[PDB]
Amino acid sequence: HWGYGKHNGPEHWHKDFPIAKGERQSPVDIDTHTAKYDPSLKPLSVSYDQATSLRILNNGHTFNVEFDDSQDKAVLKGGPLDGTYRLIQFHFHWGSHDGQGSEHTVDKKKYAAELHLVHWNTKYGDFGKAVQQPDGLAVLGIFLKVGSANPGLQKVVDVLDSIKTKGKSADFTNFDPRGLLPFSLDYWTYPGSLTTPPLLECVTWIVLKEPISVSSEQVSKFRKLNFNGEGEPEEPMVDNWRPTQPLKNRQIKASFKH
Ligand SMILES: [Zn+2]
């Protein structure tokens, strides 16, 4: 099936997922000089105080922290969004080396990793209905810049040893995802897609300008995960990122003035 290797990686996803070459694919490069301020955007509201984390798991592509999304315990509203978007999971993308790893780029520059907090529009009742709609999902993208250790990531790093191979999971309760947000919520937004197959064009992307920190040591712990399942051959989980795709007939809008 699909992955990030030379034969099954992003350059070949279009064979089985022809939307890979569609009008609204992600990620993209963000040109800070040409992304224009949009005064119609409303203030972005992140409400995570009651978020309920459940489990952390290795799905053979990344690791996901899963949240209870049966109620409005953790929601995103405002900004470019109409309505209420519920948090279902977050996950990361990272590189084999600190100089690469992010999916979005900023003025063609890559960060060491990128965090995605995935939310779905409650007017569709269920995540599975939402992903079929152009306004179905909102993903909050946060860059990780190597520097000082990040205390808000350490609880994640501390459990990765328990989920080294595909299919493993662990209890992961009482994690506060507010600890992964920067202090400024200044952002860029554009309409796009999931960055993994099935690459559905159902996402309102909200990419924060301010990165969060991660130590070189913390990101090296991401790289100790494996793509493979136990009893299968070893494939270190590195470089699980899709390269940037053409902007085509879209506009990237800024929440803030240059
Ligand atoms: Zn992602």
Side-chain angles (χ1 to χ4, degrees), residues 225-255:
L225 303 170
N226 301 309
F227 288 127
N228 54 284
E230 82 179 15
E232 308 171 335
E234 162 63 23
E235 302 175 323
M237 185 179 284
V238 294
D239 286 319
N240 57 347
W241 49 275
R242 189 193 194 187
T244 54
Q245 307 297 309
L247 189 57
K248 292 188 179 181
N249 287 10
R250 293 178 285 180
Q251 289 192 134
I252 302 176
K253 292 160 165 294
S255 75

Side-chain angles (χ1 to χ4, degrees), residues 12-107 109-205:
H12 302 291
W13 292 348
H14 73 266
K15 293 158 170 62
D16 296 339
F17 306 92
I19 200 67
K21 296 187 174 180
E23 295 191 274
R24 306 191 305 276
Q25 290 290 293
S26 294
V28 298
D29 179 57
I30 301 162
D31 184 335
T32 62
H33 313 279
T34 61
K36 295 289 104 164
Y37 171 65
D38 183 350
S40 74
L41 292 170
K42 306 302 177 305
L44 187 77
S45 173
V46 182
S47 300
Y48 287 169
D49 54 358
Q50 303 184 78
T52 298
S53 64
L54 300 176
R55 293 195 71 71
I56 188 170
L57 62 87
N58 179 334
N59 75 354
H61 309 294
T62 186
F63 67 91
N64 296 331
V65 176
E66 301 288 344
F67 285 79
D68 187 329
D69 64 344
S70 72
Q71 304 183 234
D72 283 343
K73 299 179 173 89
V75 298
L76 182 67
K77 305 172 74 174
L81 305 172
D82 282 13
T84 300
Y85 286 71
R86 261 186 215 171
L87 181 64
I88 179 169
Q89 54 101 328
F90 68 77
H91 62 272
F92 300 80
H93 304 271
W94 62 90
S96 52
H97 302 289
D98 291 353
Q100 69 189 30
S102 65
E103 295 211 307
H104 294 86
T105 56
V106 178
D107 298 330
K109 302 302 192 67
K110 297 163 175 168
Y111 289 88
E114 188 170 327
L115 162 66
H116 290 162
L117 296 114
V118 180
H119 313 73
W120 58 275
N121 190 334
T122 58
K123 81 177 157 162
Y124 298 118
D126 186 282
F127 177 87
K129 179 88 182 297
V131 293
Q132 300 174 334
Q133 323 289 334
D135 65 341
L137 303 192
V139 180
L140 180 61
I142 303 178
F143 297 117
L144 281 68
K145 182 177 186 308
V146 174
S148 300
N150 186 324
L153 287 171
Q154 196 52 39
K155 282 168 65 157
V156 175
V157 162
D158 284 343
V159 71
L160 295 183
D161 277 344
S162 289
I163 59 155
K164 284 179 186 299
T165 51
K166 177 177 184 219
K168 289 218 160 189
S169 66
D171 300 351
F172 199 68
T173 53
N174 302 124
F175 183 77
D176 185 350
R178 294 174 301 165
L180 302 176
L181 310 180
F183 285 115
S184 170
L185 304 176
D186 283 0
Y187 63 88
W188 301 283
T189 181
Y190 72 99
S193 77
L194 302 177
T195 69
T196 58
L199 298 167
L200 297 171
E201 296 177 341
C202 61
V203 182
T204 301
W205 278 95

